[PDB]
Tab-separated table of C-alpha atoms in Angstrom:
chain	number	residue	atom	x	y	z
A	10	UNK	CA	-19.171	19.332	-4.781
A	11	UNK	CA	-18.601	16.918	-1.646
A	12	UNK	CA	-21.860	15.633	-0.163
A	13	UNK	CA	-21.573	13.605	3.291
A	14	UNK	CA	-23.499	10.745	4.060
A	15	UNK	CA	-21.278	9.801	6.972
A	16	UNK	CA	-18.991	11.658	9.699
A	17	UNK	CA	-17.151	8.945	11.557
A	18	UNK	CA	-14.280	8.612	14.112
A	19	UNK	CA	-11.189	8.005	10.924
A	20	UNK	CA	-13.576	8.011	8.374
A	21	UNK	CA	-16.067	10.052	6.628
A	22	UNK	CA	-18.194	9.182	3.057
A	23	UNK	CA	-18.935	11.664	0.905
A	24	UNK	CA	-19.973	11.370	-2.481
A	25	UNK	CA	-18.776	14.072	-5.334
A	26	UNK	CA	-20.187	13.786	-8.917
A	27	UNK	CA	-20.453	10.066	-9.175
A	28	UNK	CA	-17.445	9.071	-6.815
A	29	UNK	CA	-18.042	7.635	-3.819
A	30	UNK	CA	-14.686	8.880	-1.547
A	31	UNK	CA	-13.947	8.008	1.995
A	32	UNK	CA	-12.165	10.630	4.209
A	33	UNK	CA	-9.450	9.346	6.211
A	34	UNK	CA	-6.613	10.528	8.357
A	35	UNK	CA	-3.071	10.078	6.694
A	36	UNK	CA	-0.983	7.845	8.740
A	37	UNK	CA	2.327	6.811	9.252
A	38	UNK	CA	4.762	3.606	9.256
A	39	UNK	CA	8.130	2.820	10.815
A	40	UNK	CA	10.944	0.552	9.262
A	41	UNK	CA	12.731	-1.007	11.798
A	42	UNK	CA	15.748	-3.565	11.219
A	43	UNK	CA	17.713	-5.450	14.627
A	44	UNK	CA	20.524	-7.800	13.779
A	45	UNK	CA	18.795	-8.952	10.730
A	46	UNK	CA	15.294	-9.125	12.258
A	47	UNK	CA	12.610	-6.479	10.995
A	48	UNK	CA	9.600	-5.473	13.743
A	49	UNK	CA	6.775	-6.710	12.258
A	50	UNK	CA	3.569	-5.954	14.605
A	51	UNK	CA	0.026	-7.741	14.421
A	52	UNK	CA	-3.026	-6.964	15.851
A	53	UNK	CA	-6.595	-8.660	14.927
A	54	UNK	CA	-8.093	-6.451	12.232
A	55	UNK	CA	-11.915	-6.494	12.189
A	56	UNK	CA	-12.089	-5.141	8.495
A	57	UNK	CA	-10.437	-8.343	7.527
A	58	UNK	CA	-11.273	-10.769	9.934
A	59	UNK	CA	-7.831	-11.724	10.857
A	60	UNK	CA	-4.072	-10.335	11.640
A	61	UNK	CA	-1.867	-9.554	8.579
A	62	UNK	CA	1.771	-9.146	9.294
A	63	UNK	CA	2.143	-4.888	9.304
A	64	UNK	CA	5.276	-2.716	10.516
A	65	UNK	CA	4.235	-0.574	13.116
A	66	UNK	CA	2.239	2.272	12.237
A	67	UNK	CA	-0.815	4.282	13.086
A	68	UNK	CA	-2.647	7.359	12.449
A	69	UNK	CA	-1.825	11.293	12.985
A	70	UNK	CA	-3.036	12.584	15.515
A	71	UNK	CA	-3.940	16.795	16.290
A	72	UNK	CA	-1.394	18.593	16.272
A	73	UNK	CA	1.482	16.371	14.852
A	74	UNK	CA	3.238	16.093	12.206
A	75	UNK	CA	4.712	12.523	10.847
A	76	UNK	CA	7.578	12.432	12.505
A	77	UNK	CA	6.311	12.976	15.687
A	78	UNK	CA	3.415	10.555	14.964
A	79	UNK	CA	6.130	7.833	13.774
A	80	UNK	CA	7.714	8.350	16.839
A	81	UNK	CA	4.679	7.963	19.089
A	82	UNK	CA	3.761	4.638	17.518
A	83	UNK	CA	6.806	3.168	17.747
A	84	UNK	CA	6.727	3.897	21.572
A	85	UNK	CA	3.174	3.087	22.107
A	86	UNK	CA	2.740	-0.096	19.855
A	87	UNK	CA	6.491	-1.581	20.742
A	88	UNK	CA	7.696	0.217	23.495
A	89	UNK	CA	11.023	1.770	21.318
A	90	UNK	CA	12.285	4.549	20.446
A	91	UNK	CA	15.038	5.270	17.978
A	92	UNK	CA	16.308	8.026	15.345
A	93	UNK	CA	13.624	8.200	12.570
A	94	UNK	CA	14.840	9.202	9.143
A	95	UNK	CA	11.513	10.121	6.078
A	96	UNK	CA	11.576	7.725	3.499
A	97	UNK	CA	8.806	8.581	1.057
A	98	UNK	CA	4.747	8.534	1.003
A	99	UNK	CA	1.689	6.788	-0.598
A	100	UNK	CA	-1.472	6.697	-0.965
A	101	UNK	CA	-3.232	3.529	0.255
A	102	UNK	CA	-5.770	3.277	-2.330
A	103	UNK	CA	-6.476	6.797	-4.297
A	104	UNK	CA	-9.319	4.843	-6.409
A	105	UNK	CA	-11.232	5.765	-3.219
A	106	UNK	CA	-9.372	6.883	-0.263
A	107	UNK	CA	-7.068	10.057	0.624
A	108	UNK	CA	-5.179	8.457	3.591
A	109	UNK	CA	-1.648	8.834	3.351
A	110	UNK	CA	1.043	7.097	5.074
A	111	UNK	CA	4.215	8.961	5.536
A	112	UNK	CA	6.841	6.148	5.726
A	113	UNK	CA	10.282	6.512	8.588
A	114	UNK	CA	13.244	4.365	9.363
A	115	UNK	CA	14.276	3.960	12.647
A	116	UNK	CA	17.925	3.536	13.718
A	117	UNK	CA	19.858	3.212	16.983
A	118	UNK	CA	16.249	1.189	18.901
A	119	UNK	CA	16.141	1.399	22.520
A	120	UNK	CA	13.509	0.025	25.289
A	121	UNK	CA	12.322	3.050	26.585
A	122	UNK	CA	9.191	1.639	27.791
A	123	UNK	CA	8.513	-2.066	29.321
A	124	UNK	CA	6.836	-4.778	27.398
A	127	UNK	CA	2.057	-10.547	28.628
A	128	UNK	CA	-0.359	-7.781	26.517
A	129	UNK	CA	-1.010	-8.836	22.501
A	130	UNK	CA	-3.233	-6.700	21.955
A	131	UNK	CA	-0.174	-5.349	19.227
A	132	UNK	CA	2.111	-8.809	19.207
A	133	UNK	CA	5.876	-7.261	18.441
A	134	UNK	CA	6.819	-10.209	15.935
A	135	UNK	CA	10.360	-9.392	15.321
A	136	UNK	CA	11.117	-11.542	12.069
A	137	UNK	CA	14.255	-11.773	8.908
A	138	UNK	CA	12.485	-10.045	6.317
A	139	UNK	CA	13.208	-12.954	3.949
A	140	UNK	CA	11.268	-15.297	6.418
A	141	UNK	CA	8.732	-13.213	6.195
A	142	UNK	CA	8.559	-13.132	2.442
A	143	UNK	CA	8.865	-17.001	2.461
A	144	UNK	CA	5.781	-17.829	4.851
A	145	UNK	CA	3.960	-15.278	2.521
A	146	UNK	CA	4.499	-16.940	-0.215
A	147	UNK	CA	3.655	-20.139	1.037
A	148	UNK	CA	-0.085	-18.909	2.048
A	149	UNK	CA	1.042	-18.816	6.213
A	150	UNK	CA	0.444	-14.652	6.549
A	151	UNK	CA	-0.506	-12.128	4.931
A	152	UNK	CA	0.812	-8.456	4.824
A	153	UNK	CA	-0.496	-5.140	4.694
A	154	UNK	CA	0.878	-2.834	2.700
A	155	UNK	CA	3.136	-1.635	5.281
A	156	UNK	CA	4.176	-4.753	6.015
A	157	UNK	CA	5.076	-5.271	2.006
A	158	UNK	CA	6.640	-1.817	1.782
A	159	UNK	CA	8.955	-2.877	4.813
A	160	UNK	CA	10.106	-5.946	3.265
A	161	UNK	CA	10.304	-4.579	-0.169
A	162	UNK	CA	12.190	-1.751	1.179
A	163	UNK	CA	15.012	-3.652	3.306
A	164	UNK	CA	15.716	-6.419	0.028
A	165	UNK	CA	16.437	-3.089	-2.041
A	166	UNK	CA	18.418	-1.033	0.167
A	167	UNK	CA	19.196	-2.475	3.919
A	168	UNK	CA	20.911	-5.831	2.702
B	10	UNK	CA	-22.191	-7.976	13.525
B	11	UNK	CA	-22.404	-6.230	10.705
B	12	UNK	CA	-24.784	-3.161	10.285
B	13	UNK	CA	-25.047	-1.459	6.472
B	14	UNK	CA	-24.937	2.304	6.487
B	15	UNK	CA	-24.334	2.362	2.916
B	16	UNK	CA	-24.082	-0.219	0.169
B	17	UNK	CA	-21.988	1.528	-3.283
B	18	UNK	CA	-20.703	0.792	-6.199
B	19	UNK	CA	-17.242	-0.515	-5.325
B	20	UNK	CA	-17.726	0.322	-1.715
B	21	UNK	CA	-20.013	-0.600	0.791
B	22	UNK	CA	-20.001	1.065	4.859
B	23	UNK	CA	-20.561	-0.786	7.484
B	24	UNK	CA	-20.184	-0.810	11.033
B	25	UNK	CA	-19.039	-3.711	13.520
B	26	UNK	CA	-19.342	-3.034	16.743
B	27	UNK	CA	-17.426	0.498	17.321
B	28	UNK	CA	-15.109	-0.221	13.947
B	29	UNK	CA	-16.276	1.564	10.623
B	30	UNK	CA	-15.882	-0.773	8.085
B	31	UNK	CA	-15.589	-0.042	4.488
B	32	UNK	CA	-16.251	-3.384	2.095
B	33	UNK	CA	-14.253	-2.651	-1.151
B	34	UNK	CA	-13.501	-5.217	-4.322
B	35	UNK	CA	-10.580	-6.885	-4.268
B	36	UNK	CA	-7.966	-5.873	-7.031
B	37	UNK	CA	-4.899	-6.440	-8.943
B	38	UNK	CA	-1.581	-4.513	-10.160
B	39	UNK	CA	1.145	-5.323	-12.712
B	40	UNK	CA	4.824	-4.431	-12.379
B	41	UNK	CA	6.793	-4.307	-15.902
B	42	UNK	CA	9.879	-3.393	-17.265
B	43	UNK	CA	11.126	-2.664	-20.445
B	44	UNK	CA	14.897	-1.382	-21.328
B	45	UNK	CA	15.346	-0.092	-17.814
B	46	UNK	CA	11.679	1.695	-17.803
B	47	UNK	CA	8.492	0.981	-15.643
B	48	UNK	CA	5.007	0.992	-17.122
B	49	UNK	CA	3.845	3.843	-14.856
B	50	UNK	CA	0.593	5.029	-15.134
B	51	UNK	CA	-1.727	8.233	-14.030
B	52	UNK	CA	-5.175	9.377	-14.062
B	53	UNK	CA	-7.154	11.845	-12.110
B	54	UNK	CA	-8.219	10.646	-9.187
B	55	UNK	CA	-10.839	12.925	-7.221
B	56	UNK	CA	-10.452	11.235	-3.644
B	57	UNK	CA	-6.762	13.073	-3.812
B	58	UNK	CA	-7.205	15.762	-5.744
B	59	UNK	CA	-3.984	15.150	-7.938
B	60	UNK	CA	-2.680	12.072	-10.347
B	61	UNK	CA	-0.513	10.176	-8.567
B	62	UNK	CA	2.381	7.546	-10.011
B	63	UNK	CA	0.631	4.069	-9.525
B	64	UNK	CA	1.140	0.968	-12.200
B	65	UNK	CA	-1.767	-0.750	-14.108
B	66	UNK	CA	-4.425	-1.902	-11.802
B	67	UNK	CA	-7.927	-2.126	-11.199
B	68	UNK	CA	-10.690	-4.114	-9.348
B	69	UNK	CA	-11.104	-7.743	-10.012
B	70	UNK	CA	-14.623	-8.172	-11.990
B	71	UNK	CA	-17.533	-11.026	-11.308
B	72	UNK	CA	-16.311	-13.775	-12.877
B	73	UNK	CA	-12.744	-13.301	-12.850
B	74	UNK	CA	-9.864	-14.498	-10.746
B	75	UNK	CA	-7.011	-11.828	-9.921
B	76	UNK	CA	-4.649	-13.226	-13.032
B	77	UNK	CA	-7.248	-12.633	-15.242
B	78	UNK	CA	-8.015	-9.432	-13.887
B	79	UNK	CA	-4.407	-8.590	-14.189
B	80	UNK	CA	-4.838	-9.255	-17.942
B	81	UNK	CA	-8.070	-7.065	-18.592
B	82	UNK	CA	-6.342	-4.240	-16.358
B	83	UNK	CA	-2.700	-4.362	-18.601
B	84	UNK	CA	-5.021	-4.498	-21.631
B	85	UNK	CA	-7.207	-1.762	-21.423
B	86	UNK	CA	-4.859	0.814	-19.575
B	87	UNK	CA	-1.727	-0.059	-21.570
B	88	UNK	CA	-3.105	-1.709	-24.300
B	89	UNK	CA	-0.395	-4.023	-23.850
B	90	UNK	CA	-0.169	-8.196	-23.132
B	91	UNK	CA	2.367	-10.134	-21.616
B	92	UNK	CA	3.285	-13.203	-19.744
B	93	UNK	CA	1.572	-12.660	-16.116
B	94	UNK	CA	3.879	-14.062	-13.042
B	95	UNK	CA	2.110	-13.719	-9.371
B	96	UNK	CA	4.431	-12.017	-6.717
B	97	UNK	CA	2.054	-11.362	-3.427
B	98	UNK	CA	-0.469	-9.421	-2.160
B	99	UNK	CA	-1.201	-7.216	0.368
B	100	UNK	CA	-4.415	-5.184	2.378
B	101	UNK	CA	-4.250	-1.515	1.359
B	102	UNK	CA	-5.492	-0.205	4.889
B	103	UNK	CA	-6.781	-3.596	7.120
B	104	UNK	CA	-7.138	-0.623	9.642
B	105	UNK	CA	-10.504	-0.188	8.322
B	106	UNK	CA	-11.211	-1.779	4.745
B	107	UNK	CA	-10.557	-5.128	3.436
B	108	UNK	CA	-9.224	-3.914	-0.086
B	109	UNK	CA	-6.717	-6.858	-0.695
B	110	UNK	CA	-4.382	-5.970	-3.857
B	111	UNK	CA	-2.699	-9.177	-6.003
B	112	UNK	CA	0.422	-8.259	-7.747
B	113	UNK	CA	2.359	-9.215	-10.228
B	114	UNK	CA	4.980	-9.075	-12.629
B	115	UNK	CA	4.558	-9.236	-16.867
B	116	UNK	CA	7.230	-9.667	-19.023
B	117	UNK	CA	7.678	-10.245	-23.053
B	118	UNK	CA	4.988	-7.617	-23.316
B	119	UNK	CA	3.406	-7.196	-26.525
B	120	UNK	CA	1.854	-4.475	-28.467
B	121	UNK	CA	-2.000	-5.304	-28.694
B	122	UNK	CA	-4.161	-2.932	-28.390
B	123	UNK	CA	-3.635	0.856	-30.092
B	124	UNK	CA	-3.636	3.428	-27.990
B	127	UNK	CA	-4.379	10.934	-27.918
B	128	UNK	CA	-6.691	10.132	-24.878
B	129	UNK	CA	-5.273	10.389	-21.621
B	130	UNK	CA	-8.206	9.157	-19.543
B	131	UNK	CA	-5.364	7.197	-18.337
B	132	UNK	CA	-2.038	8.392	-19.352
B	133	UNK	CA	1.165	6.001	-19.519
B	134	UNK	CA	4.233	7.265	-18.437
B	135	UNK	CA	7.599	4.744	-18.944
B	136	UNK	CA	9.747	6.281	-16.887
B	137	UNK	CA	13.439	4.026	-14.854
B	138	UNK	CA	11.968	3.235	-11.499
B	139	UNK	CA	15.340	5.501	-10.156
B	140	UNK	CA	13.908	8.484	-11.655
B	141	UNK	CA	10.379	8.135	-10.431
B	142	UNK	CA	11.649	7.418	-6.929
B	143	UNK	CA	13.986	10.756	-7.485
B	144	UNK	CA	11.290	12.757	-8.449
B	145	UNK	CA	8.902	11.759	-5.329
B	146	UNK	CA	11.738	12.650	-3.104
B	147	UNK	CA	11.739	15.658	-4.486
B	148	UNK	CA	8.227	16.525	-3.869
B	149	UNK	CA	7.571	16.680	-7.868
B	150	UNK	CA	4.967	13.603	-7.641
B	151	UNK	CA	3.732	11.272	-5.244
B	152	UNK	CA	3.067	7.561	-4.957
B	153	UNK	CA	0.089	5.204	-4.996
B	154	UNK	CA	0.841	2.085	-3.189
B	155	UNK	CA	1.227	0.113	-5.998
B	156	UNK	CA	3.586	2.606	-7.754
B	157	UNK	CA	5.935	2.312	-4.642
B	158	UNK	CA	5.593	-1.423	-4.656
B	159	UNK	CA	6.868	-1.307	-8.163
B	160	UNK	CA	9.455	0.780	-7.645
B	161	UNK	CA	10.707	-0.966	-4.345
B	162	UNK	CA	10.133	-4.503	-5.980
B	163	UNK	CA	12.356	-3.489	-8.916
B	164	UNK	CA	14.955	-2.174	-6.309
B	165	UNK	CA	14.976	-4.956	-4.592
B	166	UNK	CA	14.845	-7.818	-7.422
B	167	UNK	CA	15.245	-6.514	-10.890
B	168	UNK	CA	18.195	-4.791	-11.082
């Protein structure tokens, strides 16, 4: 049986037997390649107490579905739009978590909407640069960020 | 700063200022191949409701550093050893927990443990066929189960 000890804003706890599970909205992430460059985004991330190197990405919102979500967060965190094609899903972290990202690529970019705001830095990058500065300790990744660059060496090269 | 709503066993809840916070032990995964196959694994997981495809993996324990960790986790889910090479890392969700995953890859795995319990169950299975069957709706992906699969895409063929 699910008890709640918290309803939050993405989150909620509950506890069921002896699992502790946290509630979240499933999200969604956008591959994005441009002459060689992938869009990376950052953004400072309080849960981690710095800015990992992420695609762009967010949650679903009422009423959507992922496409449509995929294609709002491209346009709201970079200002594109493009065709999106489904790649696949995961779970972030099912030891504890049911959010779900629903992963898109996005073809054919254009500036439909006008960019000095970092709140979300657009940090268009080569993939293989940012592999390198990974493993050299300069940035980290999120897992979208990983799945991105994992994603273009296997099948956008 | 950072107010405690609830402190867990692998999770804590916290708020900072208006972001929800969940605290979670850091943890490890382990990509291997043998004769074209992947060292899949699956267990129940009650946050989702379902088994998902994920690798070996677990939290990292006091005490232990994440190639250790990496060990223990092959060991007691696979029952196999091997020789451990670190690949990267990545934040599950940095959106709202600071679960950081440390992956890597095992080769000339060994044998040393035996294992019909299916607590966890392994499940060999070519990374081509695993990423079939998800796009087929027929199972579905932790995030370290589509790392693997990308990462052997990408760099093992």
């Amino acid at each position: 049986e699910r008890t709640y000890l918290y309803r939050g804003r993405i989150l909620n706890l509950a506890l069921e037997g002896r699992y502790e599970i946290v509630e979240h909205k499933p999200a969604v992430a956008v591959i994005a390649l441009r002459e060689g460059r992938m869009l990376f985004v950052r953004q400072m991330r309080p849960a981690v107490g710095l800015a990992p190197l992420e695609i762009p990405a967010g949650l679903i919102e009422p009423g959507e579905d992922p496409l449509e979500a995929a294609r709002r967060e491209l346009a709201e965190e970079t200002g594109l739009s493009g065709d999106l094609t489904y790649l696949f899903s995961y779970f972030v972290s099912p030891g504890f978590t049911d959010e779900k990202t629903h992963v898109f690529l996005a073809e054919n970019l254009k500036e439909v909407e006008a960019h000095e705001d970092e709140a979300i830095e657009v940090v268009w990058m080569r993939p293989e640069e940012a592999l390198e500065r990974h493993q050299r300790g300069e940035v980290e990744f999120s897992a979208t960020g990983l799945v991105g660059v994992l994603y273009y060496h296997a099948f956008l090269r």
